[PDB]
Design a binder for this molecule. Structure first.
Ligand SMILES: Cc1ncc(C[n+]2csc(CCOP(=O)(O)OP(=O)(O)O)c2C)c(N)n1
Ligand SMILES: Cc1ncc(C[n+]2csc(CCOP(=O)(O)OP(=O)(O)O)c2C)c(N)n1
Ligand SMILES: Cc1ncc(C[n+]2csc(CCOP(=O)(O)OP(=O)(O)O)c2C)c(N)n1
Ligand SMILES: [Mg+2]
Ligand SMILES: [Mg+2]
Ligand SMILES: [Mg+2]
Lengths: 559, 559, 561
């Protein structure tokens, strides 16, 4: 007789789920993961990897995805993946086993924690299964909550006895939302008209585009609007690629680190003459903060979001348009149909400074510089990928902000990083998710030694799934970002809190069954990248780097 | 001017803390970790390692210890270490950064999670700093709650702005408890006297000793009582070693897996003729459950614990003595002073079976058997360690229960594993904690491939701290324990949920700067261990193993 | 077949419970309250009254008591009684119905709230029943947590379907094993700490014992009295610890209230504490609102904290010596440690005693009603006449008048003066008097309440009449939340009537509408006559007294935190 395990997997399948990422515990006595045709288990080395892979697969597909952990520490390990989903915004169904229903005594029963209480504050929905047959409605409610803006994870705790029970089990339509449900304020049309009047008066407007605009399906619409009215497009970290590489209105992504990295007044060049900022699909969690565009002259602001403003302390837009992003753009197109195109502000000196970093021909004594590494990756990505295809993934660290500034993105989600949660070790699972979402496209990963090693064991998973991911590890034997913060705050370093000894990442990758090589200059790196891209197997490249940063140029980070 | 960062580290030092284990994030701008002489930061590759190292150091020293993480994902990563502490019972002060106080918007501000809400359900105490100068009293309250039975972790969330602030900062005695504050019921002496009357009438009593008895400082007292009255001593996993190896009253440790592993009615032999079970320092979390001693004739039970019984559904003792364990033993000595010694029951067939496993001279066609691996470790541990010294640490898996049955423990906490939480990956941080707590004693670690690789990156930490831990990795390319559960529940395996590809742990260890070798039989293993023990540096030994388990023998796991 | 309703009531009876106070809702379909011999339902007009009555019965008996409410708003109404129990410290089992288990959707199902989530922050224990037969073990765990210091309420949520189910219920219960008195925590080396306390006492010229309710719960009253009498150490109390020494005892130095200097226009705190060099806070609890700032007067002092709990407030109270142990255990050890010690010379508080006696004896006739001290003096006189020695209870509701009660009310036994020190909800008076009278069935029970607090919960006058409890109630009426008008003036130096002022309520007529005989009294002579009539009536009685305060907002600096 089919049990709740079968009913659970069946309902996931009904919602389009074909993979469950995770680590299985003793609940394997209740669930094999062969119960339902068309749904396969994906075993990782750590639960964090499972949660993040599901998050990234969910982002790219735009469909709910699923991850799995055992009770107690299984669930707490998964919780960092849950945190990624809640802050980065992805519809994930997170599932964890629990002690037998009659034996649930949190902090007393072996391996028993109060899972729902722990996960509730970091999720859209959290529940414990109580009556086996109800799992079908619990999955539906989890999906419902996961697919409402801000999209996020829903959690179901599964007592082992109930998971293996057929009591009451003997499906209605799933009706999975094709795109996220959102909120809409009465009179948003009048607000959008107010925004249009502001646009009429503005000499130098900009569109600041966040990921929610991509979820709404508004990329083509935003592009046509921008092109018609000659409005520059600036993006958050993961909204890179909403305009093609080389497009005249592609003014790039912003990071608070950019002035410090470029030794150039980048933020002032970008924003100083701007008089109207339209934050299209705005989300504070993406870390493009109002302080970043508040440069030079005073600006009017328009917020467009399928959510009520959660942060009026920080952002009080002149016009708040609470509605679906695509709905807004379509109404805005009509309202601005007869408007003359604007003159856009000059950012050529910034474009020149960026092109200079990328072309940097210098050979340094102490390893490569990260801008040279990314320039090399861009070159090979452009060669390996079809037009409008390919993914560059970045883990977290100082180098990540080089990825934000310099990495090629020729499609929405063509550059992937964690903007909301920013857990180190993000790189491997995100590359797994990306490669699975785009099986015939090249997937490159860049990670630093600190973050990469925090989660490097899942190299084995990459080898086992034979995902042809090309990974570049930039190694300076340091949590480099953190050494920068030490210097910002104290004007000196303290090595015991930031410094490592040597890790041979080439030998590490090969130990996991991943072919690898060391590259120490542009010539060796291009060769290694070209080899990896054509290998038909995963490949890893270790690059020695150094940063030589100055803490004085990073005032934009202050909160 | 000294800030809350200084006040925090100073108060930790006041409470005897000399090390802070963790990973530092952007809060480094507010805290360097050189503010206070006598406290050193111990940088790990993952926050879980930091939390568990502190837990184990706190267990062995009996003093509060400290761990550290950044905001958001740092805190969620640390929470698996916090869960270890809460279920395994150790006084850990867990510290995590938080977003700037005026910018705390959980699930909206970049990396901002509601840390206190997430950690409260799995801690003794959880608070967020609000006024910088109060950090001193918050540390004190954290220590107070951590050092009350059941001992556990206390959590302080630290907004980056407040941590770096000197506002209101211009010490009172710390008065750190020497041993845990315990719960004591009125009339416990009367209950203890009722226990004495039960002992007088009993023909075959046993002492079942848990870790709380060790925390109480009751080991010598319990030994003296057991010897005078000829009462056999049986232990939980980590209470192994309360009697020396070879002691006539050392009846061994219990695990629910023992019948299936030994292919022998082990629980029956241990408990069948027993008529009185005294659970001295009982804790359900340790997973020695009433169903395990409920074999053969009817038994009376006496519970002794410095806590009120949290599980009356499961355990209703005939006599419940709520008091300090040492206080009970001292009162019990007086009440039983004139008692004649008992005739102890015969467990020689069980001792014989255990000895048979250890001496197994066969070289199997596939890998070694885990009992052979442990016998080899025992041999070299006995050679390398002074009498009453040495630590064998076990990670989590099927092999762990072989450790419980077979591993040598010649002192309290001589065999260390995670009995309450049992997170895989526990091995490395526990060995770090153990070696640091016992700097002049040998520390051996056994871990399986599944659990070891979940947290294997902290091999670099072992190399960096130059801790001379000898690690044995028992590799069957499987989450073996989980395949067992598949077979128990379904009478077949499902490889996608349990099977890995090959990892070369020798090459992996060497990539991290740890010398390593492979050993495939007793001779190679003994040679490798003897080399490791004398090396004066960390060493790793990979051993191929197989289980060939029989699912039908594990009925004790269900009840 | 017996259901979980029967099992629940049987387990409560096993733990010695004979009454369940509350208001029943639709869960009556699952529970009648006649299922079990020896346990009766006590119906109130509002759930707050039920929780507080259980709280007070638990305080005086020292044993766990029980209250009941329906789902949703039943539970939220009960929660103010739960808050009373958690802050005032009493072992109460709070029970509330919940939606059918399969229909629990908080904030969506009709009347469905997340009860466990709401009550958990203000309770020792909070759980929802899931498998009917487990109610027995849930009650045991609830009692266990309620009876561990600091004592407080434990809450069980009862889905109506499961409450009415016989699934898995086979009717002999295991032993109840209720703690004999509250369980506490004990620090290793508390004896050494106690010896350090004795060393401080050896050197002290003018030590004092500051005694809180936890000392009473520990059964330490006779032991503390014997210690104080031998060593000539004055005893000072919190509000409900009045009566640990008899009225007139030379070492009975009275209770402390932060309001005392301003009510008396006297340096009362200075007189009480200035020459003291050692303060032993015996069974200390911050919630009782005797704060360190109140004894920190005059010369520098050493402090000893004795409590069956670890210090929860080191920011506020850092004792020189902290003795974490059972209060009785401490006193017995301290007796041995100080056996050789002779008696101290106690400090002189006669000027304060004279001021207090002056208020009580106030012979003035005022144009604008009586004064509260005159009202309390009259109550004291009649209480003394009506009660056997060492007996009687004066109950006080909450308001400005309550602190007159603290200073002036007779207490000739522990809990002889009863008020809410931790929670201090207005309306407390009636349920407390109900609980007190039931706990002490043959003793006089008087209640003083102000018009604001009394009318907040006056409907349970009908309950007093129905239960025929011979409580004598005095309502002191000034048509104002007077305490709040005081705070307006403290903070702003003026009043604002819309926030504090009422129109006229005839409490005599109100009482009679509820079936309680009543009368108005406007001077000492009429009040003494009314009280004497009430005390001998054999029925409840209510007396309305017009009062005014004429307070001085400038004299309440001690209140500042
Ligand atoms: C779970 C978690 N803990 C701590 C941090 C703080 N942190 C962010 S990135 C990072 C890694 C920095 O080192 P690396 O990956 O080598 O990149 P680098 O800054 O040196 O360029 C750390 C420790 C984090 N981001 N996530
Ligand atoms: C954090 C966490 N996730 C999942 C589990 C389930 N689990 C327990 S031990 C273990 C490892 C079993 O494999 P291995 O370490 O190789 O030991 P083996 O059973 O093969 O002897 C796993 C996956 C766990 N214990 N902890
Ligand atoms: C539940 C609750 N709400 C508000 C208060 C604030 N408060 C305390 S006592 C009280 C009553 C004051 O008026 P009254 O009972 O007439 O006594 P008075 O101060 O006039 O002497 C009020 C409103 C309270 N104590 N309890
Ligand atoms: Mg680095
Ligand atoms: Mg294995
Ligand atoms: Mg009034």
């Amino acid at each position: 007789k089919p049990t709740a395990a079968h009913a659970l997997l069946s309902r996931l399948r009904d919602h389009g789920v074909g993979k469950v990422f995770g680590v299985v515990g003793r609940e394997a006595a209740s669930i094999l993961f062969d119960e339902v045709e068309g749904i396969d288990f994906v075993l990782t080395r750590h639960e964090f990897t499972a949660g993040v892979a599901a998050d990234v697969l969910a982002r790219i597909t735009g469909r709910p995805q699923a991850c799995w952990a055992t009770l107690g520490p299984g669930m707490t390990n998964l919780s960092t993946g849950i945190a990624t989903s809640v802050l980065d915004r992805s519809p994930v169904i997170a599932l964890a086993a629990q002690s037998e229903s009659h034996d649930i005594f949190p902090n007393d029963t072996h391996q028993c924690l109060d899972s729902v209480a722990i996960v509730a504050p970091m999720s859209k929905y959290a529940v414990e299964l109580q009556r086996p047959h109800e799992i079908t409605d619990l999955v539906d409610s989890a999906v419902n909550a996961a697919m409402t803006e801000p999209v996020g994870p829903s959690f179901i705790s599964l007592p082992v006895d109930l998971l293996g029970s057929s009591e009451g089990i003997d499906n209605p339509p799933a009706n999975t939302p094709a795109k996220p449900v959102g909120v809409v304020a009465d009179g948003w049309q009048k607000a959008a008209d107010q925004a249009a009047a502001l646009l009429a008066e503005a000499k130098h407007p900009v569109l600041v585009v966040g990921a929610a605009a991509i979820r709404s399906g508004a990329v083509p619409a935003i592009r046509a609007l921008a092109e018609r009215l000659n409005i520059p497009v600036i993006t958050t970290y993961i909204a890179k690629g909403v305009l093609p590489v080389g497009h005249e209105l592609n003014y790039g992504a912003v990071t608070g680190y950019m002035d410090g990295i470029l030794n150039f007044p980048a933020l002032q060049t970008m924003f100083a003459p701007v008089d109207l900022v339209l934050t299209v699909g705005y989300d504070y969690a993406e870390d493009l903060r109002p302080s970043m565009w508040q440069k030079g002259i005073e600006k009017k602001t328009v917020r467009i979001s399928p959510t009520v403003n959660p942060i009026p302390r920080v952002y009080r837009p002149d016009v708040d348009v609470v509605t679906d992003v695509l709905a807004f753009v379509e109404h805005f197109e009509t309202a601005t149909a007869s408007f003359g195109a604007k003159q856009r502000h000059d950012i050529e000196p910034l474009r020149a400074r960026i092109a200079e970093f990328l072309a940097d021909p210098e050979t340094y004594e102490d390893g490569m510089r990260v801008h040279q590494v990314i320039d090399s990756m861009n070159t090979v990505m452009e060669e390996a990928a079809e037009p409008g295809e390919g993914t560059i993934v970045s883990d977290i660290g100082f180098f990540r902000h080089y990825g934000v500034l310099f990495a090629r993105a020729d499609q929405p989600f063509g550059f992937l990083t964690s903007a909301g949660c920013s857990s180190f070790g993000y790189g491997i699972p995100a590359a797994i998710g990306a490669q699975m979402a785009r099986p015939d496209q090249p997937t490159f990963l860049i990670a630093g030694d600190g973050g990469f090693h925090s989660n490097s064991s899942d190299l084995e998973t990459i080898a086992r799934l034979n995902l042809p991911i090309v990974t570049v590890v930039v190694n300076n034997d340091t949590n480099g970002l953190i050494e920068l913060y030490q210097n910002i705050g104290h004007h000196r370093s303290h090595d015991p809190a930031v410094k490592f000894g040597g890790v041979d990442f080439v030998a590490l990758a090969e130990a996991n069954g991943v072919d690898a090589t060391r590259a120490t200059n542009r010539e060796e790196l291009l060769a290694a990248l070209r080899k990896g891209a054509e290998l038909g197997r995963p490949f890893l490249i270790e690059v020695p780097v150094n940063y030589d940063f100055q803490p004085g140029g990073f005032g934009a980070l202050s909160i």
